[PDB]
Design a protein around this nucleic acid. Structure first.
Ligand SMILES: [Mg+2]
Ligand SMILES: [Mg+2]
Ligand SMILES: [Mg+2]
Ligand SMILES: [Mg+2]
Ligand SMILES: [Mg+2]
Ligand SMILES: [Mg+2]
Ligand SMILES: [Mg+2]
Ligand SMILES: [Mg+2]
Ligand SMILES: [Mg+2]
Ligand SMILES: [Mg+2]
Ligand SMILES: [Mg+2]
Ligand SMILES: [Mg+2]
Ligand SMILES: [Mg+2]
Ligand SMILES: [Mg+2]
Ligand SMILES: [Mg+2]
Ligand SMILES: [Mg+2]
Ligand SMILES: [Mg+2]
Ligand SMILES: [Mg+2]
Ligand SMILES: [Mg+2]
Ligand SMILES: [Mg+2]
Ligand SMILES: [Mg+2]
Ligand SMILES: [Mg+2]
Ligand SMILES: [Mg+2]
Ligand SMILES: [Mg+2]
Ligand SMILES: [Mg+2]
Ligand SMILES: [Mg+2]
Ligand SMILES: [Mg+2]
Ligand SMILES: [Mg+2]
Ligand SMILES: [Mg+2]
Ligand SMILES: [Mg+2]
Ligand SMILES: [Mg+2]
Ligand SMILES: [Mg+2]
Ligand SMILES: [Mg+2]
Ligand SMILES: [Mg+2]
Ligand SMILES: [Mg+2]
Ligand SMILES: [Mg+2]
Ligand SMILES: [Mg+2]
Ligand SMILES: [Mg+2]
Ligand SMILES: [Mg+2]
Ligand SMILES: [Mg+2]
Ligand SMILES: [Mg+2]
Ligand SMILES: [Mg+2]
Ligand SMILES: [Mg+2]
Ligand SMILES: [Mg+2]
Ligand SMILES: [Zn+2]
Lengths: 119, 43, 89, 121
RNA sequence: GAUGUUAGGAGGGCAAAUCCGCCGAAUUUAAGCAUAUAAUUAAGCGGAAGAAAAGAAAAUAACUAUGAUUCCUUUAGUAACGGCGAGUGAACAAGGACCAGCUCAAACGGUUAAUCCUUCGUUUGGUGCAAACCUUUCGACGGAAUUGUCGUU
RNA sequence: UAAAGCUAAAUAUAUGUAGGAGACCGAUAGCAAACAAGUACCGUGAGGGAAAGAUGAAAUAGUACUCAGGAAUGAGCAAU
RNA sequence: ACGGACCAAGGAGUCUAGCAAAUGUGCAAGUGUAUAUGAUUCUUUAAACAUUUUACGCAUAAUUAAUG
RNA sequence: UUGUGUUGAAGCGAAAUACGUGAGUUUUCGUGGAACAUCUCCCUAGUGCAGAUCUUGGUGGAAGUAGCAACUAUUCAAAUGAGAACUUUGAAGACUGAAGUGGAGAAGGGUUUCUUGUCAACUGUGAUUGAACAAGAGUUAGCCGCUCCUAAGGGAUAGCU
RNA sequence: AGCACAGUCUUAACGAUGGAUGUCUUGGUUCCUACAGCGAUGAAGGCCGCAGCAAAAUGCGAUACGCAAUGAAAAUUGCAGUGACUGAAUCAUCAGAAUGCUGAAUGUAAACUACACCAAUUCCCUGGGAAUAGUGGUACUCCUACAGAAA
């Protein structure tokens, strides 16, 4: 029934091995079901779940490795890029939006909107 | 007839599957049946 | 004419004008014409008309699960940065 | 009432009650604790668990104490040791009691319960 | 100028209540009908956003003058239009909501394009458990650009 | 001071999602749809488009048992 | 002459705009606080309250195509 | 506003030495099983039905009536079964009469095929039958097709509108 | 053991038929407030799947009525089985992972699971050792940059 916290520590090969075993077990169960049996029909669900868990663990490991590989370097795969609503991606970064023509900037610096308490 | 496209065959199969009645055990915790002669799939 | 306008002529009704329509699944793909009556299938465009309000309602964005759109809803509310989990323990 | 984020609206409330998730259900199957228990812990009332020992107050069995057998969050009903009842068949089932109508005496107490008590304090 | 599965990017479709462009009827009213009316509406086609559009005067006034746009109250069912029939019909001022101004081009700077971008980098920081982000200034190697970038007003 | 350009606010919203309200409707009403409803079903097709809520406090009380019946059912001195 | 086999439920002068008359009510050469503001206004409150420490409407004057 | 309700509300049914000219009101008994009035005043409206070839749903008389008459035609015995004119088997008698209710395919249908069950409805008489219902099963290709070619034609590329 | 003629019509009582009335109400409607886009990073829409016993809807996507993580937190139950004594059974949350075939659909096609061509691709172990015909890519228009040819 193997829960994830055990599996994080395992190396990828070991994980793969585990997964194959689980798959084999599942296949066996399926075969049994197909044949006139209902002894361990309900065992299958758990096995399936276990398999799923294993897959998840492995997938996340793989993703982490990928991320490590493509750390920085301007361009990246579009997977490892910031998946985010298209419009937002298109949109100008806040900094870009801010960026002021030099005269305007100067003006801002000189005559900023002051605080002035009226009495 | 006796020469279908794969898609059509699959659809037919789906329809057949849909046809079958409520599994009786559920009733312890159907109106969309279709008889092949009276109501057509209209494919 | 035995194959006259009514019942006799309904005997000669075999052979579909429309089949199933890749895209809409609505048995309204005119085979001979190669064009769906409720889509405009080959036209990259959905063929909907403001004169058909019922039609519009029976195929809008809400009608059918929204595999991705639904998932993205709530994200604004959350405003979580992408890639980020919660703290463990 | 005074905060207008919550709804008074009867319908809405009823929907919430009936269609509540499991956590909500658990929360709203609470029971009054006896005087002794109240004195012991600042708590007035607790969500009832399996091995608690309740005294029934209302219903046909206004007095029969017993260990809670099962709590059933679908129907909002606890069942109690000996509140037995034959069906038409003869099969001896437990009679359901809603936790309004019960007051819990002896307390099932795991770490979670302890934590809850501490929080209440 | 073609050409490239060259390197990097963009568009396409869905959705529409409000919104912006076109395109564009007729029923209807006139006790008929033809101009009118319906209506610069419906439908059609296209395009945006959380709002859109408008907007910083080639404006109004004729005053002791006001001062971008928008919206509300009004002006006003008024001026006006109209087989002067049916019917249609604003604007300025006034009272408010809200109030925000600006930069190109042209002028000027050649004791030198000061600009700008792509790729490759380099090394201080900040929050994060990580993931990512956030900024920091520093060069190269490319190009772009004198058929004009940047500063000055 | 036309023939180049930008610009927040007050404004609108019968679409969607989420809230909240009502001198609103109460199952022939109210959305077409309180229910596996844009579902079933009809139409080649564009499209058209329903009906259908309520046992009881509790079925973890949904009809045990006996008799008559081929069975459905019926009856009970039997039963929730 | 037409409609009505029967029964149940549904089923038809309504709502807005602007004008008028009638009548009630307030105030009365005035009247209406319009938008909007303000409040120690905030379940009800989308009401109620208030009107800044010469707005506008209709009326108070008519008449003329008109300068008047 | 000031009240009635599980010592039984609304509703409904039948009434009543009842009241009202009348719309109605009121009360009794029964059923019913939870709400209900306000006439103290006035507020509000999707406010009152016999008609609309009204709408919707239901139910009648017609009426156990019309009718269940194309395709020449059935009969005997036995079986199965609660039950057999129309299920099965046998024996007769018949018909289709290779332009066939015969064999194969196309379109269309879509599992109707098949076995085992089986009868609530349906199979306009019956029914143990069934194309109904339920449970399972069943479609095997290098050569049969599609897949390739081009046809009448279609959709596009360039432009051009 | 007897006696009512029968039918038609009427009234009352007690039933059938039907679903009115009344009572409800996880629904609608209206108004108010608030935010407000999804998509070549493959959208909406459509198909096909996915449960031990599973039709619909609901949920989900070959990790398929769910995985991870977080916050609850002892059950779930029709049976089978799985769990507790807290990453576990179940809920909510949902940011990680994943997301079949399509569809703008985009390699050519389309009543095809038809067909090209270019990369062979993928995994494991710290440069080898394993797999699988599997996996990607190739649309049109456009922009910047580069390329070597054209006048
Ligand atoms: Mg076919
Ligand atoms: Mg037929
Ligand atoms: Mg044709
Ligand atoms: Mg577009
Ligand atoms: Mg006319
Ligand atoms: Mg006329
Ligand atoms: Mg005419
Ligand atoms: Mg339009
Ligand atoms: Mg703008
Ligand atoms: Mg105005
Ligand atoms: Mg006026
Ligand atoms: Mg006009
Ligand atoms: Mg200008
Ligand atoms: Mg502009
Ligand atoms: Mg309805
Ligand atoms: Mg006549
Ligand atoms: Mg007449
Ligand atoms: Mg008649
Ligand atoms: Mg009639
Ligand atoms: Mg008056
Ligand atoms: Mg009453
Ligand atoms: Mg009416
Ligand atoms: Mg009526
Ligand atoms: Mg009537
Ligand atoms: Mg009448
Ligand atoms: Mg009728
Ligand atoms: Mg009749
Ligand atoms: Mg027969
Ligand atoms: Mg013969
Ligand atoms: Mg003959
Ligand atoms: Mg058969
Ligand atoms: Mg029959
Ligand atoms: Mg059979
Ligand atoms: Mg069948
Ligand atoms: Mg061959
Ligand atoms: Mg060819
Ligand atoms: Mg040709
Ligand atoms: Mg063409
Ligand atoms: Mg008699
Ligand atoms: Mg947008
Ligand atoms: Mg989990
Ligand atoms: Mg946890
Ligand atoms: Mg393609
Ligand atoms: Mg073909
Ligand atoms: Zn289509």
């Amino acid at each position: 029934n193997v829960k994830a916290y055990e599996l994080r520590t395992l190396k990828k090969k070991e994980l793969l091995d585990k997964l194959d075993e689980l798959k084999k077990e599942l296949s066996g169960l399926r075969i049994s079901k197909a044949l006139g049996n209902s002894a361990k029909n309900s065992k299958i669900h758990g096995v399936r779940k276990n398999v799923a868990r294993v897959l998840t663990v492995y997938n996340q490991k793989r993703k982490m490795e990928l991320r490590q590989l493509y750390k920085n370097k301007k361009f990246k795969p579009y997977n490892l890029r910031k998946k985010l609503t298209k419009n937002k991606r298109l949109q100008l970064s806040p900094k870009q939006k801010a960026a002021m023509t030099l005269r305007q900037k100067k003006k801002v610096q000189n005559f900023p909107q002051r605080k002035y308490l009226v009495v | 007839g006796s020469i279908k496209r794969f898609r059509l065959k699959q659809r037919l199969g789906k329809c057949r599957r849909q046809n079958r009645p409520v599994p009786h055990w559920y009733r312890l915790k159907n109106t969309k049946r279709r008889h092949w002669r009276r109501t057509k799939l209209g494919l | 004419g035995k194959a006259g306008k009514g019942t006799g002529s309904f005997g000669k009704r075999n052979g579909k004008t429309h089949f199933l329509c890749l895209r809409c699944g609505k048995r309204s793909y005119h085979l001979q014409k190669k064009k769906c009556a409720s889509c405009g299938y080959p036209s990259a465009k959905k063929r909907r008309f403001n004169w058909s309000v019922k039609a519009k309602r029976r195929n809008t964005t809400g009608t059918g699960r929204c595999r991705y759109i639904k998932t993205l809803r709530r994200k604004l509310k959350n405003k979580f940065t992408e890639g980020s989990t919660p703290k463990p323990k | 009432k005074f905060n207008k984020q919550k709804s008074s609206s009867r319908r809405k409330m009823r929907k919430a009650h009936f269609t509540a998730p499991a956590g909500l259900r658990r929360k709203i199957m609470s029971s009054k604790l006896s005087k002794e228990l109240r004195l012991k812990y600042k708590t007035r009332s607790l969500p009832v668990r399996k091995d608690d020992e309740v005294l029934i107050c209302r219903g046909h069995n206004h007095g029969r104490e017993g260990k809670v057998v099962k709590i059933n969050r679908k129907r909002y009903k606890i069942y109690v040791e000996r509140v037995t009842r034959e069906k038409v068949n003869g099969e001896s089932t437990f009679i359901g009691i809603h936790p309004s109508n019960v007051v819990l005496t002896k307390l099932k107490v795991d770490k979670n319960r302890k934590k809850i008590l501490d929080r209440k304090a």
